[PDB]
């Protein structure tokens, strides 16, 4: 699955278009490398995300194409927040 689609179904972003935008601004890295909106993402990958000043690092735990709302938070885990 793509990064933008993963951020959307995991409910890290509300609108898929903004998930695409944030990745296309280069505000996302996978496994330390900068990542494009199309980037493949799998469980056991590291994501770093620049939400304004808040540099959040998360790891993916699961993959899905659809979910119930609470179950979306089950998809991934944080590991650090910085700013």
């Amino acid at each position: 699955m793509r990064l933008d689609k993963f951020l959307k179904v995991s409910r890290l972003i509300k609108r898929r278009t903004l998930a695409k935008e944030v990745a296309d601004q280069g505000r996302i890295s996978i496994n330390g490398n900068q990542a494009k909106a199309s980037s493949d993402v799998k469980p056991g990958d590291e994501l770093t995300v620049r939400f304004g000043q808040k540099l959040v690092t998360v790891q993916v735990n699961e993959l899905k194409d659809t979910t119930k709302k609470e179950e979306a938070a089950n998809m991934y885990t944080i590991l650090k927040e910085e700013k």
Partner: peptide, 17 residues
């Protein structure tokens, strides 16, 4: 209710955090 950190509030509300 969960709260995903992209809301960029002072706090994050996620299981295990």
């Amino acid at each position: 209710k969960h709260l995903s950190p992209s809301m960029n509030s002072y706090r994050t509300v996620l299981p295990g955090q």
